[PDB]
Amino acid sequence: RPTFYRQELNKTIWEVPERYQNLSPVGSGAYGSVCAAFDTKTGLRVAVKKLSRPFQSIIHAKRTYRELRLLKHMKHENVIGLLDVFTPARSLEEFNDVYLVTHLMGADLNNIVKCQKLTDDHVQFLIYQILRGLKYIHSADIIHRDLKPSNLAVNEDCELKILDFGLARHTDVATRWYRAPEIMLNWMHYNQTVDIWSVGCIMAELLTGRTLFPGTDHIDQLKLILRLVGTPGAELLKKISSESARNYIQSLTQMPKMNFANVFIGANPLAVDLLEKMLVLDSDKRITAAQALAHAYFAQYHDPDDEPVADPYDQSFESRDLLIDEWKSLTYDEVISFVPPPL
C-alpha cells in the first residue's frame, strides 16, 4: 500500500498514489472522468480514469464490476488494457472509489480528422488496427456494440486502441450514425458483425471526410442506410418478426443498391471492395473481423501468425441480479487481486 495524496480538479476530488504525478484533466464521459499523469515508476505517460459514483445503484454497481472485469482481461495492443487499478480505501467497508490506469494515447479518431481526408495508407493502417483488436475482442465472445470515432484512441505513431467508453466532454458525434441496422430495429439477438457495420461506417468516413449516415433520428437513419445499400429483398424481409418495422420498410419507395464504385469515387478500388463486404444489410453475409484481415486491402499488414485470439471470457455474471453490496464486494476482490503487467 503506497502513499496517496489529494487534489481537486474540476470539482472532482482525486486521491492517487504518488507514483502518478502531474495530473492534468483530459475530459469526461457519463461514467467517469479522465486525467493525464506521469507514472514515475514506469516512466510512461498514463491515463487515469476515476469512475463516477461506481455504486450509486444496481446499474452502476454492475457496470463498475463489468468494466473492471473487462479491462482486466484485455491484453492486446489494439485493445485498451490495464497498467494499474487502485482504491484509496483500506477495507471493503469503506470502499467507494475505483481508479483505472492505462497508457496515455493523447487523442481519439474523432479528433484526428479535423473534418478532413486522410491518405489511403493511414486508412489501411487504421482500419487494420481496428479489425485486429476486433478479431481479438470477438474471439472472447464480446461484442463492442458502440464502435464510433470517439471510442478509438490514437497516438502520434498512428497507433490505435479500442476504448470501452470514450469522452463525451473534452477539457481542451452521435452513436446512431454507426449502429448496425439490426440494432436500430431492436433485434433481441445479434452477432458480432454488428461491430463490422460500424467499422464500415468509420472507414467510409475516413476515405471521404464525411459521415456515411448522418441521420437526424432513428427513422431518418434507416432511410439513409436503405438509400445506399438498397431496400431489402424478400429473403431478408422474411426475417423481421415485427409487423410495424416490416410495414415501415415495405411502405418505403423501394430503392436499388448503389454502385459503391460511384459513391466512393477516387478511393482505392480495394478499399471500395472491402466496404461492399462490410456494409451488407444481412448480418449473415457481412465479412467477419478475421476474414477482413485476409482481404487484399491489408496485404502490406496482414499476418495470421501475429493476429492473436483472446483467452475465453466468463460472461456468466452478465445474467445475475445481485445486490449493490455483492456487486461491490466482487469489484473489491478484483481491485485486490490485480497483477500488473511487467515493464
Ligand X SMILES: CCCCCCCCO[C@@H]1O[C@H](CO)[C@@H](O)[C@H](O)[C@H]1O
Residues engaged in binding ligand X (CB under 6 A): 70, 74, 79-80, 137, 142, 144-146, 162, 164, 181-182, 185, 187, 189-190, 222, 225-226, 232, 236, 239, 249, 281-284
Strands 32-39 and 44-51: antiparallel
CA–CA distance, 87 with 82 (Å, rounded to integer): 14
CB of 31 to ligand X, least distance (A): 9
| Three-class secondary structure of residue 24 per DSSP | strand
* Largest interatomic CA distance in the chain: 66
260: Cβ contacts below 8 Å, ≥ 6 apart: 272, 275, 276, 279
DSSP state, residue 94: G
- Cα 57 versus chain centre, distance: 24
Cα–Cα distance list, 96 to 127, 305, 316 (Å):
38, 43, 25
Q: What are the binding residues for ATP?
A: 26-34, 49
**Three cell numbers written together for 314:** 466468463
* CA-wise closest residue to 195 among 252, 248, 127, 146: 146
CB distance 79 to 289 below 8 Å: no
Shortest Å distance, C-beta 199 to ligand X: 14
Query: Shortest Cβ distance from residue 174 to ligand X (Å)?
Result: 13
118 touches, from ligand 3FF, ligand X, none (C-beta below 5 to 8 Å by class): none
Active site residue 39: no
Contacts (CB under 6 A) with ligand 3FF, residues 95-154: 100-102, 104-108, 153
Please state the length of the chain: 343
Q: Which of 164, 195, 306, 333 is catalytic?
A: 164
Partner in contact with 108, chosen from ligand X, ligand 3FF, none, beta carbon below 5 to 8 Å by kind: ligand 3FF
Partner interacting with residue 49 (select from ligand X, ligand 3FF, none; CB below 5-8 Å by kind)? ligand 3FF
Asked whether position 25 contacts ligand 3FF by CB under 6 A, the answer is no
Distance CA 107, CA 100 (A): 18
| Cβ closest to ligand 3FF, residue 28 vs residue 211 | 28
CB 171 within 8 Å of CB 9: no
Position 172 contacts ligand 3FF (CB under 6 A):
yes
Least distance between ligand X and beta carbon 19 (Å): 24
What's the CA gap between 194 and 198, in Å, rounded? 7
Instruction: Tell me the number of residues near ligand 3FF by CB under 6 A.
Output: 22
Interface characters, 66-95, with ligand 3FF (x: CB under 6 A)? -----x--------x-x-------------
Tell whether residue 167 is a contact of ligand 3FF (CB under 6 A).
yes
Residue range at the interface with ligand 3FF (CB under 6 A); choices 87-95, 164-172, 263-271, 283-291: 164-172
Least Cβ distance, residue 266 to ligand X (angstroms):
27
Binding residues: 26-34, 49
Which residues form the catalytic set? Answer: 164
